[PDB]
């Protein structure tokens, strides 16, 4: 329920979904009680949180940040833009980050509320808690 197993994610703020990310980190919601350290350097991070829409111009740059992370890693696509392309079916928008980087949790919303982002993280933890529990 409450695990000392810490998670070190890198928040990739690209659009509006990033503003809601800051509100979750602030004094109103306490995302620390869940063991989220939030390191800023991608070299020492294991969870890639894509918060915002990914433009085709940013796709090669984002993929590089992913391959540059240690192998025990997960990825959370916050909002529909990073999940499936969101409300932008246009010539310059990448329809979902899972097309260039596997994602483990999709958080719907435009943008999701701070609690929705928290529930989404618990879901990632739920997965990991029983990912090392089967085999």
């Amino acid at each position: 329920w409450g695990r000392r197993n810490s998670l070190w994610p890198v928040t990739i703020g690209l659009a509006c979904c990033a503003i809601e990310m800051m509100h979750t980190a602030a004094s109103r919601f306490d995302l620390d009680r869940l063991g989220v350290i939030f390191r800023a350097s991608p070299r020492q991070a294991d969870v890639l949180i894509v918060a915002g829409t990914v433009v085709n111009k940013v796709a090669p740059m984002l993929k590089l940040i992913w391959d540059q992370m240690p192998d025990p890693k997960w990825c959370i696509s916050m909002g529909g833009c990073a999940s499936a392309g969101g409300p932008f079916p246009t010539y310059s928008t990448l329809q979902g980050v899972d097309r260039i980087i596997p994602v483990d949790v999709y958080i719907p919303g435009c943008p999701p509320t701070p609690q929705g982002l928290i529930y989404g993280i618990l879901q990632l933890q739920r997965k990991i808690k029983e990912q090392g529990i089967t085999k």
Partner: protein, 47 residues
């Protein structure tokens, strides 16, 4: 001849450290209930 004395000066503490101690009246008083609405335990209901 006779000459009285004054004790005033550039002794700005009569009104400067007074304002600096204002932080002790606000920052110290800011130790109230935590604004945090813990989630998953104790959710904020949407309007």
């Amino acid at each position: 001849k006779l000459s009285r004395k004054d004790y005033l000066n550039i002794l700005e503490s009569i009104l400067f450290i007074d304002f600096l101690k204002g932080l002790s009246v606000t920052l110290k008083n800011l130790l109230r209930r935590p604004i945090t609405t813990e989630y998953p335990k104790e959710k904020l209901t949407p309007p």
